[PDB]
Design a protein around this motif. Structure first.
Motif, PDB file in Angstrom:
ATOM      1  N   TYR A 189       0.831  -1.205   0.000  1.00 31.74           N
ATOM      2  CA  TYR A 189       0.000   0.000   0.000  1.00 31.74           C
ATOM      3  C   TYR A 189       0.865   1.255   0.000  1.00 31.74           C
ATOM      4  O   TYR A 189       1.402   1.646   1.051  1.00 31.74           O
ATOM      5  CB  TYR A 189      -0.953   0.019   1.189  1.00 31.74           C
ATOM      6  CG  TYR A 189      -1.928  -1.133   1.225  1.00 31.74           C
ATOM      7  CD1 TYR A 189      -2.947  -1.232   0.286  1.00 31.74           C
ATOM      8  CD2 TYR A 189      -1.853  -2.102   2.215  1.00 31.74           C
ATOM      9  CE1 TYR A 189      -3.842  -2.284   0.312  1.00 31.74           C
ATOM     10  CE2 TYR A 189      -2.753  -3.149   2.259  1.00 31.74           C
ATOM     11  CZ  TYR A 189      -3.740  -3.238   1.302  1.00 31.74           C
ATOM     12  OH  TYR A 189      -4.644  -4.274   1.345  1.00 31.74           O
ATOM     13  N   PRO A 190       1.040   1.892  -1.165  1.00 32.73           N
ATOM     14  CA  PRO A 190       1.788   3.163  -1.231  1.00 32.73           C
ATOM     15  C   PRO A 190       1.168   4.290  -0.418  1.00 32.73           C
ATOM     16  O   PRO A 190       1.897   5.107   0.148  1.00 32.73           O
ATOM     17  CB  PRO A 190       1.789   3.483  -2.733  1.00 32.73           C
ATOM     18  CG  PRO A 190       1.671   2.149  -3.393  1.00 32.73           C
ATOM     19  CD  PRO A 190       0.729   1.374  -2.507  1.00 32.73           C
ATOM     20  N   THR A 191      -0.159   4.384  -0.375  1.00 29.27           N
ATOM     21  CA  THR A 191      -0.863   5.427   0.369  1.00 29.27           C
ATOM     22  C   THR A 191      -0.740   5.268   1.886  1.00 29.27           C
ATOM     23  O   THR A 191      -1.179   6.155   2.626  1.00 29.27           O
ATOM     24  CB  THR A 191      -2.335   5.454  -0.039  1.00 29.27           C
ATOM     25  OG1 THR A 191      -2.810   4.112  -0.207  1.00 29.27           O
ATOM     26  CG2 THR A 191      -2.511   6.215  -1.345  1.00 29.27           C
ATOM     27  N   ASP A 192      -0.159   4.164   2.348  1.00 33.17           N
ATOM     28  CA  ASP A 192       0.166   3.881   3.743  1.00 33.17           C
ATOM     29  C   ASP A 192       1.565   4.330   4.148  1.00 33.17           C
ATOM     30  O   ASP A 192       1.860   4.357   5.350  1.00 33.17           O
ATOM     31  CB  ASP A 192       0.008   2.387   4.022  1.00 33.17           C
ATOM     32  CG  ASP A 192      -1.390   2.033   4.456  1.00 33.17           C
ATOM     33  OD1 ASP A 192      -2.190   2.960   4.699  1.00 33.17           O
ATOM     34  OD2 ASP A 192      -1.700   0.829   4.547  1.00 33.17           O
ATOM     35  N   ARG A 193       2.427   4.623   3.169  1.00 30.48           N
ATOM     36  CA  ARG A 193       3.778   5.144   3.398  1.00 30.48           C
ATOM     37  C   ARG A 193       3.856   6.273   4.425  1.00 30.48           C
ATOM     38  O   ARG A 193       4.738   6.249   5.292  1.00 30.48           O
ATOM     39  CB  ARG A 193       4.332   5.615   2.055  1.00 30.48           C
ATOM     40  CG  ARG A 193       5.723   6.160   2.040  1.00 30.48           C
ATOM     41  CD  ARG A 193       6.156   6.413   0.585  1.00 30.48           C
ATOM     42  NE  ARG A 193       5.851   7.704  -0.048  1.00 30.48           N
ATOM     43  CZ  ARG A 193       5.947   8.937   0.449  1.00 30.48           C
ATOM     44  NH1 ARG A 193       6.366   9.179   1.678  1.00 30.48           N
ATOM     45  NH2 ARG A 193       5.613   9.967  -0.323  1.00 30.48           N
ATOM     46  N   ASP A 194       3.008   7.298   4.303  1.00 30.33           N
ATOM     47  CA  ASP A 194       3.058   8.434   5.227  1.00 30.33           C
ATOM     48  C   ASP A 194       2.898   7.983   6.679  1.00 30.33           C
ATOM     49  O   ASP A 194       3.752   8.263   7.537  1.00 30.33           O
ATOM     50  CB  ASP A 194       1.979   9.450   4.856  1.00 30.33           C
ATOM     51  CG  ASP A 194       2.323  10.232   3.607  1.00 30.33           C
ATOM     52  OD1 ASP A 194       2.219   9.660   2.503  1.00 30.33           O
ATOM     53  OD2 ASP A 194       2.694  11.417   3.731  1.00 30.33           O
ATOM     54  N   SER A 195       1.789   7.301   6.974  1.00 29.34           N
ATOM     55  CA  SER A 195       1.487   6.866   8.331  1.00 29.34           C
ATOM     56  C   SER A 195       2.442   5.798   8.851  1.00 29.34           C
ATOM     57  O   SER A 195       2.620   5.714  10.067  1.00 29.34           O
ATOM     58  CB  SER A 195       0.052   6.343   8.407  1.00 29.34           C
ATOM     59  OG  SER A 195      -0.388   6.273   9.752  1.00 29.34           O
ATOM     60  N   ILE A 196       3.226   5.153   7.988  1.00 33.08           N
ATOM     61  CA  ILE A 196       4.121   4.093   8.445  1.00 33.08           C
ATOM     62  C   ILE A 196       5.475   4.733   8.693  1.00 33.08           C
ATOM     63  O   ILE A 196       6.204   4.340   9.614  1.00 33.08           O
ATOM     64  CB  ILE A 196       4.190   2.941   7.418  1.00 33.08           C
ATOM     65  CG1 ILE A 196       2.941   2.069   7.518  1.00 33.08           C
ATOM     66  CG2 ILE A 196       5.438   2.082   7.579  1.00 33.08           C
ATOM     67  CD1 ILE A 196       2.652   1.275   6.276  1.00 33.08           C
ATOM     68  N   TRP A 197       5.757   5.811   7.962  1.00 29.75           N
ATOM     69  CA  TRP A 197       6.962   6.579   8.233  1.00 29.75           C
ATOM     70  C   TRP A 197       6.825   7.241   9.596  1.00 29.75           C
ATOM     71  O   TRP A 197       7.730   7.159  10.435  1.00 29.75           O
ATOM     72  CB  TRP A 197       7.215   7.622   7.145  1.00 29.75           C
ATOM     73  CG  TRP A 197       7.750   7.053   5.868  1.00 29.75           C
ATOM     74  CD1 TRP A 197       7.876   5.734   5.549  1.00 29.75           C
ATOM     75  CD2 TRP A 197       8.302   7.784   4.768  1.00 29.75           C
ATOM     76  NE1 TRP A 197       8.428   5.598   4.299  1.00 29.75           N
ATOM     77  CE2 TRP A 197       8.706   6.843   3.801  1.00 29.75           C
ATOM     78  CE3 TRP A 197       8.479   9.145   4.499  1.00 29.75           C
ATOM     79  CZ2 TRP A 197       9.262   7.219   2.581  1.00 29.75           C
ATOM     80  CZ3 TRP A 197       9.050   9.515   3.297  1.00 29.75           C
ATOM     81  CH2 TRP A 197       9.433   8.555   2.351  1.00 29.75           C
ATOM     82  N   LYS A 198       5.697   7.931   9.807  1.00 30.16           N
ATOM     83  CA  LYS A 198       5.402   8.545  11.103  1.00 30.16           C
ATOM     84  C   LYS A 198       5.398   7.481  12.207  1.00 30.16           C
ATOM     85  O   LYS A 198       5.911   7.719  13.313  1.00 30.16           O
ATOM     86  CB  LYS A 198       4.064   9.279  11.019  1.00 30.16           C
ATOM     87  CG  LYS A 198       3.556   9.895  12.304  1.00 30.16           C
ATOM     88  CD  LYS A 198       3.874  11.391  12.210  1.00 30.16           C
ATOM     89  CE  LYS A 198       3.250  12.241  13.300  1.00 30.16           C
ATOM     90  NZ  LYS A 198       4.293  12.798  14.205  1.00 30.16           N
ATOM     91  N   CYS A 199       4.776   6.321  11.930  1.00 31.10           N
ATOM     92  CA  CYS A 199       4.711   5.200  12.867  1.00 31.10           C
ATOM     93  C   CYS A 199       6.104   4.815  13.342  1.00 31.10           C
ATOM     94  O   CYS A 199       6.359   4.701  14.547  1.00 31.10           O
ATOM     95  CB  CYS A 199       4.015   4.010  12.206  1.00 31.10           C
ATOM     96  SG  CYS A 199       3.826   2.574  13.277  1.00 31.10           S
ATOM     97  N   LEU A 200       7.022   4.605  12.395  1.00 31.16           N
ATOM     98  CA  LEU A 200       8.362   4.150  12.740  1.00 31.16           C
ATOM     99  C   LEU A 200       9.145   5.279  13.387  1.00 31.16           C
ATOM    100  O   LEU A 200      10.102   5.022  14.127  1.00 31.16           O
ATOM    101  CB  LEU A 200       9.084   3.618  11.506  1.00 31.16           C
ATOM    102  CG  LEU A 200       8.540   2.266  11.050  1.00 31.16           C
ATOM    103  CD1 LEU A 200       8.825   2.010   9.585  1.00 31.16           C
ATOM    104  CD2 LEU A 200       9.093   1.145  11.914  1.00 31.16           C
ATOM    105  N   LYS A 201       8.779   6.529  13.080  1.00 35.39           N
ATOM    106  CA  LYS A 201       9.393   7.667  13.752  1.00 35.39           C
ATOM    107  C   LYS A 201       9.073   7.590  15.240  1.00 35.39           C
ATOM    108  O   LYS A 201       9.935   7.851  16.086  1.00 35.39           O
ATOM    109  CB  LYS A 201       8.919   8.981  13.120  1.00 35.39           C
ATOM    110  CG  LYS A 201       9.224  10.264  13.901  1.00 35.39           C
ATOM    111  CD  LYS A 201       8.072  10.801  14.736  1.00 35.39           C
ATOM    112  CE  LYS A 201       8.616  11.632  15.888  1.00 35.39           C
ATOM    113  NZ  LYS A 201       7.557  12.380  16.610  1.00 35.39           N
TER     114      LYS A 201
END
Lengths: 823, 626
Positions: free
Chosen positions: A400-412
């Motif tokens: 899911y490319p549209t999940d990239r934002d929230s997974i970047w923030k998640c791992l942050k």
């Protein structure tokens, strides 16, 4: 009407026609001052009427009328109580008691009225009809001195179960009104928990929860055992026993109230999770039921109890994470939310984390985002779980490319919390070979970029992490600190408002200039304000608002200079004139300032409407320049004068702020304009427009432009949508809407096919989501259909704002290719 | 004893009976025919409907649109609710749902009207009703339309409008479609009941659903209070349908038989119409045209699908696809399959050996029937032109049927076949009239006709019959068919909308139980028949009466026997006074006196108290209490 209703009810036949007329009359509303006459007529016909159904409908109607506006029903309660005393039938008596309840609720500040009402409720409380007793108990509950508890308490033993429910609800409503119930109600309610009707048990468990919350530390003795027990613990046991009740609604209620109590002792709290005080295994049985609703209630109850008791949360961890395997969607969302809520008091175990990871494979967007937030707030104890979380997140990155934002923030957020667990996993992830310079990974690979985000948020707390970085790791760090400073943390390796006000003051002061100088100054200031809006984000709204106003003024003065270039009417040339276009442009821009911006107080609305009036006058004059007909000229003239009159009526309190304005001077010579010839009216309108003064625009304290961004279709690099000939193709639309107070009624979606046809779509409120203040998220489907096409053309999709009719675009247009191939 | 009828629609009743201590709602019903006055909701904005000319009057114009003479409303379709304000629905204790067709409008009652009672229905009815509200809400909210039209509802304006819009009734009571939150809330207040399950309502009345044979989970209800029984006969069928046949036996000994859900178009034989439908679609398909079959996703679609499966094999039309487009298509097929124990003996025997009951599983397996959730999904990829499509609402006002009517309406090759009789096929077809499409009306109504209901009435023999007034007169289309009537030996009283019927079934002798302890102290006698006397305390709990252990007398005491028998039973010095039609006996001890009247006796004591009790007891030798 009063006399009309009177004569109609007199002439109508008693059993059916009168009932139909009353049915028709009940729908239409009645003015407050006329209520007295119509209720008097209804009472007179009530006395006359013998039919029970007609009298019942009269009672229902005249109870309905007591809710109408600020009518004062203190003059219509003596006749009401009189007819109630005289009434024989049970339905009519119950309906009259309903009417009396309505009147009492309409006058809660009146005391003597409420004492009369409760007295007459007590009088009719012994009627054989269960409905009459129900309404009497409802009166005693809604109205009552705060004796009444004893009167209501007497009917906990009533033979009719629904009368028992009514009595319990009356006591509950008395408590909600502020009354302090007696402890004696506890024993009466305890008997009702073994009733043979689910409503009695539900009301009884509600009442027992109320009384336990009122007297938690009071001591109640066990009947058999000589043990002194606090009341709250005994109620906890009684409610826990109700979690095994046969009916699921009682179980839901029991779980909810079990959640709501937190004064219970620790060992009682521990007992509900152990296998084997009848509260043993209460949550164990309450978490594995067939019904999903009781499971949701138990999950929420576990949330409240764990927040109150961290020691309880430690025991609840395994039970709640095992619930994640439950395959009801709302159940698992609530489990996620509750686990996130109790996250501060806990830390996950190795096998529990293994369990939740093995069933972490989610598909839908909402569950995935909820998991991302949970992982943001989570606490784990094993680095192997961190590795598995990284594996699943990269799978959900490639999936899911549209999940990239929230997974970047998640791992942050994940690394900032767990630096120690990431430190062994750092060379496990960076692929740093011990004795070889490894290839430089693709800096555009989202998975890799998220591995760096995690490792850099962990590095913030961990001196030992900067050591294990490779050379390209340092290079990549230096870039993502600049480019993504909101995700990557730093490691250890006003003039705008003043300019705006100055520019506006410069425009306002220099209104004595010649037309060329005035319009070039306006052009300079409009360009400056547009650029300032482009630069600053917060002042984009103010700059665009003021620039729109100045553009309206510039168009007006340009049109008036064209009128100066204009000559006698029959010589007028249409192709070389742009005054009508100027009037239309001022029309649309005034709509834009009215609706496409927020924080617009009335002091700006008056100025917007004044500019609108000026534009309407300009359009009238320009039309008069062309039309040789006298009747249409008279029609538009009187329409404009009516518009001026309506403006004067609506903004009457704002006229002193409009000194030397167009409308002010217009209102000075009001009747002369009313009685003058249309040609003379046009002439003086032109002269007064030219001599009118430019009104200052009072800036609001806070104002933001209404913006929208279509993001889901994206650019046209995607392949055309095929197989659409005749049938429908659904195009998924996602958009972020900024500073739209009421988007549901106003935002619309327009679709423009390559032909002249245009489609207008009105999205339902369920499409709009509100993740933040002044920041909406619109997700929906727009359906497109058209006949077969020889070549894949592109269809333009744009978001419009609507106002009240008429619409204005406020989003950037996007295009998508469709190939409706036949078959 | 009372019956509040909240809907004038015959096949969509809403009746409340204030009988005993409970007011029970029989069905909810949603008069969907109000939607035919509104412009249809298309999936994609059509040029034809958008550019329709507004209607002209002396005054508005944008609210109303005109198409081929008929005048419609340019607004979201609205639904005519049952009369909710006639009786306070807060007082309704129980709602009984017979069919999934009558299950609609339930969200309105449960949410908006302050109803806090219970809803009882059979599980297939609940599931199929859930599917119907799912698809209805999906269709309505798919491409929402505003409700700007309110001027035409005015009392003085509706009179001047043309006939379809002028004859609409209770227009002010029309409401837009309920939201899905209301649907989910309403179905949460439901209790699932099986056939012949005795449900006690507060210990007062017992209700059982009885299989009607009309649909899956279709049920008739009988309400009884152990002496007076009220039978509710909703839509029922005595044909060879899949559900188990009507339980006619349990309707016997009924004081009142409220009768609704009789067939529309009574002259039509459903088997012949099914054959005609199959033949017509075969003829259309053979010539290369398409076929559109507006239907509900779970109603008569299954029966005609079975007949089509049988027909195509002989007709040599196995190549053509059978499309079934609805948001609840797969759910409908699966629910029809799993409810195997709710079928007749012939079809429920398929559960013994491993085999799904319905044969359309074989249609799916051989890829003959292809169900899709919408038009935009895989359907647009798998669409083949000479096809037959079952989709959309039969009202032709929303769903995919609007899109297919707008698509195939321009060609004479394609055909639209109407099978549901609940919508006037000329009125539903009104917003599309200048089409060249071949329109065929062969409704399939398996419900009871008047011959069948006459035979059932003569079999059951109810004391009183309640039916809509539409059945007490011949239908207006015929107006001369005396056979299309409910003929009963009683007059068979009827009702219209918002009418209150005072039933004459008021009876005494409520049942009560006497415990053995008190029965031990109760002793009978002999009269002319047995009789006893009871003095006890009454204990009532949950409307069930129990007799817990704690003036008139009768016998044969003529003047001759009075003078002779008790003359010397213990006293002395007794004289008889020669009074007319009797004798007066008094004693000289203290002028104690005994006087007798015709069929009566009484004892007088004069300044004496001890002998008075024995004086009374002497006469009590042969005096009972009859």
């Amino acid at each position: 009407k009063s006399a009309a209703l009177h004569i109609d009810l007199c002439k109508a036949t008693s059993p059916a026609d009168a009932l139909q007329y009353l049915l028709q009359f009940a729908r239409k509303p009645v003015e407050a001052e006329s209520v007295e006459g119509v209720v008097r007529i209804l009472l007179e016909h009530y006395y006359k009427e013998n039919d029970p159904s007609v009298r019942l409908k009269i009672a229902s109607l005249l109870g309905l009328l007591s809710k109408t506006a600020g009518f004062s029903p203190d003059c219509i309660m003596d006749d009401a109580i009189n007819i109630l005393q005289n009434e024989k039938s049970h339905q009519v008596l119950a309906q009259l008691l309903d009417t009396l309840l309505a009147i009492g609720t309409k006058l809660p500040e009146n005391q003597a009225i409420q004492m009369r009402l409760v007295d007459v409720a007590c009088k009719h409380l012994t009627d054989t009809s269960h409905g009459v007793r129900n309404k009497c108990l409802q009166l005693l509950g809604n109205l009552g001195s705060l004796d009444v508890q004893k009167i209501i308490g007497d009917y906990f033993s009533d033979q009719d179960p629904r009368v028992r429910t009514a009595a319990i609800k009356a006591m509950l409503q008395l408590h909600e009104r502020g009354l302090k119930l007696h402890q004696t109600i506890y024993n009466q309610a305890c008997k009702l928990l073994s009733d043979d009707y689910e409503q009695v048990r539900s009301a009884a468990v509600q009442l027992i929860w109320v009384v336990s919350q009122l007297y938690p530390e009071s001591i109640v003795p066990i009947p058999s055992s000589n043990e002194e027990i606090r009341l709250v613990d005994d109620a906890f046991g009684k409610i826990c026993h109700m979690v095994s009740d046969g009916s699921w609604v009682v179980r839901v209620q029991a779980a909810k109230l079990l959640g709501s109590m937190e004064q219970v002792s620790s060992h009682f709290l521990e007992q509900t999770l152990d296998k084997k005080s009848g509260a043993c295994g209460a949550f164990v049985h309450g978490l594995e039921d067939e019904m999903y609703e009781v499971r949701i209630a138990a999950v929420e109850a576990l949330c409240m109890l764990a927040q109150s008791s961290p020691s309880f949360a430690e025991k609840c961890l395994d039970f709640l994470v095992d619930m994640f395997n439950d395959e009801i969607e709302e159940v698992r969302l609530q489990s996620i939310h509750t686990m996130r809520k109790i996250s501060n008091n806990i830390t996950l175990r190795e096998d529990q984390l293994d369990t939740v990871l093995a069933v972490l494979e989610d598909s839908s967007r909402d569950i995935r985002e909820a998991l991302h937030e949970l992982l943001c707030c989570t606490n784990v104890s094993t680095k192997e779980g961190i590795h598995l979380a990284l594996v699943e997140l990269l799978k959900n990155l490639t999936k899911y490319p549209t999940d990239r934002d929230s997974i970047w923030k998640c791992l942050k957020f994940l690394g900032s919390r767990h630096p120690t667990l990431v430190l062994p996993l750092v060379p496990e992830l960076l692929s740093t070979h011990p004795f070889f310079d490894t290839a430089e990974p693709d800096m555009d690979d989202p998975a890799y970029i998220a591995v760096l985000v995690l490792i850099f948020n962990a590095a913030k707390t961990c001196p030992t992490m900067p050591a294990l970085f490779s050379d390209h790791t340092f290079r990549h760090y230096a870039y993502l600190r600049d480019s993504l400073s909101h995700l990557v943390p730093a490691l250890r390796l006003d003039p705008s408002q003043q300019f705006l006000q100055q520019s506006l003051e410069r425009v306002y002061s220099l209104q004595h200039l010649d037309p060329q100088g005035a319009q070039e100054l306006l052009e300079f200031t409009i360009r400056d304000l547009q650029r300032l809006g482009e630069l600053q984000s917060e002042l984009a709204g103010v700059a665009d608002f003021s620039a729109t106003y100045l553009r309206c003024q510039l168009l007006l003065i340009k049109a008036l200079q064209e009128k100066l270039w204009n000559v006698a009417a029959p010589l007028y040339l249409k192709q070389s004139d742009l005054a009508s276009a100027a009037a239309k442009q001022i029309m649309e821009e005034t709509y834009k300032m009215e609706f496409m911006y927020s924080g617009v107080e009335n002091k700006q609305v008056v100025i917007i409407h004044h500019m609108r009036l000026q534009a309407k006058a300009l359009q009238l004059i320009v039309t008069a320049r062309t039309t040789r007909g006298l009747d249409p000229l008279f029609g538009m003239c009187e329409k404009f004068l009516q518009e001026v009159d309506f403006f004067q009526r609506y903004f009457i309190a704002d006229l002193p702020h409009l000194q030397d304005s167009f409308v002010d001077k217009l209102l000075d010579l009001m009747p002369r304009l009313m009685t003058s010839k249309p040609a003379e009216v046009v002439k003086i309108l032109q002269t007064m427009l030219r001599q009118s003064a430019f009104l200052h625009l009072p800036l609001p304290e806070q104002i933001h432009k209404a913006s929208a961004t279509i993001i889901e279709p994206a650019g046209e690099s995607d392949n055309p949508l095929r197989f659409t000939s005749g049938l429908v193709v659904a195009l998924d639309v996602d958009a972020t809407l900024e500073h739209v107070q009421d988007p549901q009624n106003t935002v619309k979606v327009q679709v423009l096919y390559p032909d002249g046809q245009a489609q207008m779509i009105h999205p339902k409120p369920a499409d709009f989501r509100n993740p933040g203040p002044g920041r909406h998220r619109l997700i929906t489907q727009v359906y497109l259909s058209h006949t077969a096409w020889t070549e894949a053309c592109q269809v333009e999709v744009r978001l419009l704002l609507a106002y009240n009719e008429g619409t204005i675009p406020f989003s950037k247009p996007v295009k998508v290719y469709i190939m409706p191939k036949p078959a | 004893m009372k019956l509040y009828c909240l809907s004038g629609h015959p096949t969509l009743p809403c009746n409340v009976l204030k009988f005993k201590s409970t007011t029970i709602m029989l069905d909810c019903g949603l008069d969907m025919t109000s939607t035919l006055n509104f412009l249809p909701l298309p999936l994609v904005q059509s040029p034809r409907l958008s550019n329709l000319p507004g209607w002209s009057l002396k005054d508005l114009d944008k609210e109303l649109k005109e198409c081929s003479g008929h005048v419609f409303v340019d607004s979201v379709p609205e639904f005519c609710l049952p009369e909710t304000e006639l009786i306070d629905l807060s007082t309704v204790d129980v709602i009984l749902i017979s069919n999934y067709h009558c299950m609609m409008a339930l969200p309105y009652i449960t949410e908006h009207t302050g109803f806090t009672g219970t809803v009882y229905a059979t599980e297939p009815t609940v599931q199929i009703g859930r599917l119907l509200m799912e698809e209805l809400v999906n269709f309505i909210e798919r491409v929402p339309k505003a409700q700007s039209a309110s001027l035409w509802k005015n009392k003085d304006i509706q009179r001047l409008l043309p006939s379809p819009l002028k004859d609409a009734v209770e227009v002010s009571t029309w409401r837009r479609c309920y939201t899905m939150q209301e649907v989910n809330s309403a179905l949460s207040k439901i209790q699932l009941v099986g056939y012949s399950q005795k449900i006690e309502l507060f210990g007062a009345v017992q209700v059982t659903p009885l299989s009607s044979g009309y649909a899956l989970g279709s049920s008739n209800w009988i309400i009884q209070s152990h002496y007076e029984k009220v039978s509710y006969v909703s839509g029922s069928s005595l044909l060879t349908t899949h559900p188990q046949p009507m339980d006619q036996a349990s309707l016997k000994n009924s004081d009142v038989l409220v009768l609704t859900g009789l067939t529309q178009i009574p002259t039509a034989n459903p088997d012949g119409m099914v054959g005609e439908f199959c033949s017509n679609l075969a003829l259309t398909v053979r010539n290369g045209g398409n076929v559109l079959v507006p239907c509900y996703p779970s109603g008569v679609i299954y029966d005609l699908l079975e007949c089509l499966y049988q027909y195509i094999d002989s007709a040599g039309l196995s190549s053509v696809p059978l499309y079934f487009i609805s948001p609840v298509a797969n759910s409908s097929l699966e629910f029809s399959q799993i409810f195997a124990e709710w079928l007749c003996h012939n079809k429920q025997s398929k559960v013994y050996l491993p085999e799904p009951p319905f044969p359309h599983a074989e249609l799916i397996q051989t890829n003959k029937l292809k169900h899709y959730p919408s038009i935009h999904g895989d359907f647009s990829n798998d669409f083949r032109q000479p096809c037959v499509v079952f989709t959309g609402h039969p009202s032709l006002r929303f769903g995919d049927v609007v899109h297919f009517m707008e698509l195939w309406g321009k060609s004479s090759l394609n055909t639209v076949i109407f099978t549901e009789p609940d919508f006037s096929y000329l009125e539903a077809l009104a917003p599309y009239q200048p089409l060249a499409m071949k329109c065929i009306y062969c409704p399939i109504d398996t419900r009871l006709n008047f011959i069948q209901v006459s035979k059932l009435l003569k079999e059951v023999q109810p004391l009183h019959v309640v039916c809509p007034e539409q059945y007490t007169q011949p239908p207006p289309a015929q107006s001369h068919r005396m056979d299309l009537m409910i003929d009963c030996q009683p007059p068979a009283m009827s009702y219209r909308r918002a009418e209150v019927l005072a039933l004459p079934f008021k009876r005494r002798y409520e049942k009560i139980e006497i415990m053995p302890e008190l029965a031990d102290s109760l002793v009978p006698m002999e009269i002319k028949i047995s009789l006893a006397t009871v003095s006890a305390v009454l204990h009532t709990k949950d409307n069930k009466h129990l007799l817990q252990p704690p003036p008139l007398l009768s016998g044969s005491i003529p003047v001759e026997q009075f003078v002779q028998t008790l003359e010397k039973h213990g006293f002395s010095d007794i004289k008889v006074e020669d009074t007319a039609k009797g004798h007066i006996v008094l004693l000289q001890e203290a002028e104690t006196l005994i006087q007798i009247e015709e069929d009566s006796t009484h004892i007088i004591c004069d300044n004496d108290e001890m002998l008075r009790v024995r004086l009374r007891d002497l006469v009590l030798k042969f005096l009972q209490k009859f």
